[PDB]
Every structure is written in structure tokens, then in C-alpha cells.
Amino acid sequence: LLKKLVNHVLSSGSWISHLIKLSQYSNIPICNLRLDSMDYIIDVLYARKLKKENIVLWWNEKAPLPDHGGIQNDFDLNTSWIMNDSEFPKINNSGVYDNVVLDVGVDNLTVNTILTSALINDFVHDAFSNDALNVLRGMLKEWWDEALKENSTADLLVNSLASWVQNPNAKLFDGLLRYHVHNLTKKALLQLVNEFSALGSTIVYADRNQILIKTNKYSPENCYAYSQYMMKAVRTNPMFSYLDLNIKRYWDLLIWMDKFNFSGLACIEIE
């Protein structure tokens, strides 16, 4: 505990300087922003652009439900269905595989899904307001463009938007918004499956991060350049250009049941 006390005393200064750097871009007072919860700055910058675009906020402080005109706290089967159902449909294909089974980690899947909403679609009662989602899509495009200039604040916003959407603690937690993002994430994952299948590669497992696919090659020494060509060809695709796909493991001979029951032979790096 004395080690912890000295650690906080000698590490306060970097935290204070990070508050100053956060407040330089966030345009929020240093006392009023919460550093510990990153969703507050997301909510206030978002609501600033909503108020700029002449559209009524659903800013509700002391309840996870939105305002919606005060006619909330009434049960409906529509909002219960779109707010209750949280289920990600995994694509599982059991069996033994002699091809070089590739493990790719998918990062910023939610961000690449919600950022390219104008390309996925290429009176609805359960639909989020379209103009507010155009506002958020343009705002995330601005945040991603500012993140390439090594703004660590904007990097933290683009890494924290995915946790902001899932969080009911935030002021603008709307169930229609979260259901919109979740359904679009399902659509983007199925389109990623179709794009990997269009290059002659059948998947083994699909998830939010881990995706295991089966190629046409037999040995990884003949499969490394083909794997690089495949991942650069799917990075070439317009619907998936902000997707961080990184290879985690090469599997030579694999037995698959699900993610919790697998055995086989693998190598991390090719040598």
C-alpha cells in the first residue's frame, strides 16, 4: 500500500498532462470531463454535431433509456425485441481439414462496419434516424482522418466508440442505434464470408475477432504468398478498407468442433 501511495504521488503528473491534452481537443472543461469514462466526451461531441444539424437530442442523464419525448417507460414488444436480443450468429463448420487453415484476427470490426454504412446498403419502425447516423458516420470519418495524424485523443475516441455504443451508462444509449449497429455487423460479417468465398476460400469459424478459413493450398511454404495476396485483395475491397486483419496462427492439419474444442498442428511464424 505504501508502494501504491508513492506510485500515485509520482504518477499524478502524466495523468494531469493527459487531462490537458484531452481538454485541448475535446473542448470540455478539465474539471467537468470524466477521464475514467471515455463515453462522456463521445456523447457531448456527438450531441454538439446533432445540435449543429438541427435535430432533437435524446440526451437522458439519470436513466439508460432515451428521452423519446417523455413517452418512454412504456412497454412495447418492438423495443423489447430490438433491445433484448443480443446474439451474434457464429458460423461453425466441424470436421478435419488438411489445407493450411488460416487464423485472422479482425480488429475494428464495429468501427469499419459503422464507418462504411453508405456502402453496406449497396417508415421502418425499428430503424434508427438516418440523418443522425449520417452525422455519426461523417464524424467517425473525421475522427479516423485525424487519427492518422497521430492524435492520441482521436485514437482513443475511435477505439472507444465501440464501447460507447454497447454502454447503457452513456447519455445517448438508444436501443435502436445499438440494434442498427449489431444488424449491420451481422451483414458485414456475412459479406466478409462471401468475399472470402469469392476468392476460393471456405471459412471454418467466424466471430467478432477470430476468423478461421480453409484455403486451397496444402503446405504453408506454398501458401504464404497466396495468403498475403488474399488479405491484400480483401483490403482492396471498398466495403472493407478500415478492417485490421492480422494473421495470428498458421494451422497445417486441424480438427474443428468449435472454439472451445480444437486440436491439431500449428506454427505461429513461417520459417
Binding site: 414488444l77 425485441w81 446498403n121 417508415f123 421502418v124 419502425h125 425499428d126 444488424n183
Partner: protein
């Protein structure tokens, strides 16, 4: 009392084929029949495995043991006792109808005749399975027989709804067997996306009041998308949800 068994004119009853082609009987003989039970084979795996186990238990002789045990249980009676009970119920009980039962019977008859209007509207040809006044007499006789099971001299309403259930299961089930459909399917698959829902009032105000199609085309094509299982109904039938 006549109990007849028959196959269709085609080799098996085809759900793809029209019901007029399967039956070359005249409408007179189906008017005389009271239960027109059309039965099919849906090839359900649960039903196939259940019938497989049942016929296996029959052939091995274990069904002899199960029926012999269930007779001593008391839920089944043999041929002789049921035969003598048939004779006693025909020779003792001949029931009438309560006045409150007649309202339900006449109301269900005019309801199923109004449904026969809807059945014979879009096909534009006469149905091979008719519902006439003799079928009302048939449901009357079903109600009186349901009273004659338990030696009840009054056929109450509890027997009436079971008679209505039997008639809907037999005869109403038997009788219920171009650009608008494809244009509706394309417009609705483009209109609402995968995983989102639309109220029926929105479709009524935008697809009937617009006169994009007819209301009958909407009612037929919603069922057509329901049986294709890509677009289903939820929330008491007031929401149309794309399953995807």
C-alpha cells in the same frame, strides 16, 4: 353410415398441383359426404421416426404388451365393450340442441360460407369441395353424436366447439388446399432490409392507398413470403419482420 376411402386421380396428392386436378369426383358426392378428410405425407423427421418406432413395436410384438397393459390401465376398451356401447348409445340416447347452441352453429355456418367466398374469389372457378346446407346438417349430426358419446340428452356448447373443430380439421382444411407478386416481392425486399420490421398499417397505406397493387395481392403475397420463411410475422401479427 358410409365410410369410403380413396386416392386422388393423380398417383399421390400433390400440393403443387391444383385441388381441382386431383379430384375428378362430382361436387354432388362431396356434398353427400360429411367429413372429407384429405390426408398428406409431409415427411417430417419426428413423425417418420415416431411411426418407425411404432410399427417396429407392432411387428416385434411389444405393442401387444403395451395395449394389454393399457387396457388394464383403463384408458382403452376392447372391441366387444365398445361394440355394445355403440349399440346402447344408439338405442338409448337421441339428443336435441340447446337454444344457445343454435346461435353458435348458425354463426359458424355463415362464417365458413363467408370464408368460402374468399376461397372462391381469386381462383375464379368453382371449388371441387363444396360447403352447402347439408354440411350444416353434418355439423348438427356431429354435435348430436358428441352428445351421444356420454348419453347426454342435451347437446351443449362444449360439444359444439368440438364439432366445429372437427369440421375445420376435415372439410375447411380440405377446401383450403403475375407481375403483382414478383413486383411486390422485389419492392418489399428492397423496401425493408434484413433484420428490420414494418407495421401492417404502413404497408396498407403505402401499397393499397397508393394503389400500387390490390389488397388481395398483398394478403396473398404476405403468406407467400411467410411460407418461404425469409420474411415472417411477429408481435401478434401486427409486425412484419425479415428473418434474413
Amino acid at each position: 353410415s358410409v365410410l369410403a376411402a380413396a386416392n386422388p386421380i393423380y398417383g399421390r396428392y400433390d400440393d403443387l398441383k391444383s385441388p381441382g386436378d386431383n379430384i375428378d369426383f362430382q361436387t354432388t358426392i362431396l356434398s353427400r359426404f360429411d367429413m372429407i378428410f384429405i390426408v398428406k405425407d409431409d415427411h417430417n423427421e419426428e413423425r417418420d421416426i415416431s411411426i418407425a418406432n411404432h410399427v417396429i413395436n407392432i411387428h416385434t410384438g411389444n405393442a401387444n404388451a403395451m395395449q394389454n397393459q393399457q387396457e388394464e390401465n383403463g384408458s382403452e376398451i376392447s372391441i366387444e365393450k365398445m361394440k355394445r356401447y355403440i349399440t346402447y348409445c344408439r338405442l338409448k340416447c337421441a339428443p336435441r340442441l340447446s337454444p344457445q347452441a343454435a346461435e353458435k352453429l348458425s354463426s359458424n355456418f355463415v362464417t365458413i360460407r363467408k370464408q368460402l367466398l374468399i376461397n372462391e374469389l381469386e381462383s375464379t372457378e368453382r371449388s371441387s369441395i363444396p360447403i352447402t346446407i347439408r354440411q350444416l346438417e353434418a355439423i348438427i349430426r356431429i354435435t348430436e353424436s358428441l352428445a351421444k358419446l356420454e348419453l347426454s340428452p342435451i347437446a351443449q356448447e362444449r360439444h359444439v366447439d368440438e364439432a366445429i373443430r372437427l369440421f375445420q380439421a376435415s372439410t375447411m382444411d380440405a377446401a383450403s388446399q403475375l407481375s403483382e407478386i414478383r413486383r411486390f416481392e422485389q419492392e418489399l425486399k428492397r423496401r425493408l432490409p434484413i433484420g428490420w420490421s414494418t407495421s401492417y398499417q404502413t404497408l396498407r397505406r403505402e401499397f393499397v392507398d397508393t394503389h400500387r397493387f390490390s389488397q388481395l395481392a398483398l394478403d396473398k403475397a404476405l403468406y407467400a413470403l411467410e411460407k418461404h420463411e425469409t420474411i415472417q410475422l411477429r408481435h401478434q401479427g401486427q409486425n412484419i419482420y425479415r428473418s434474413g
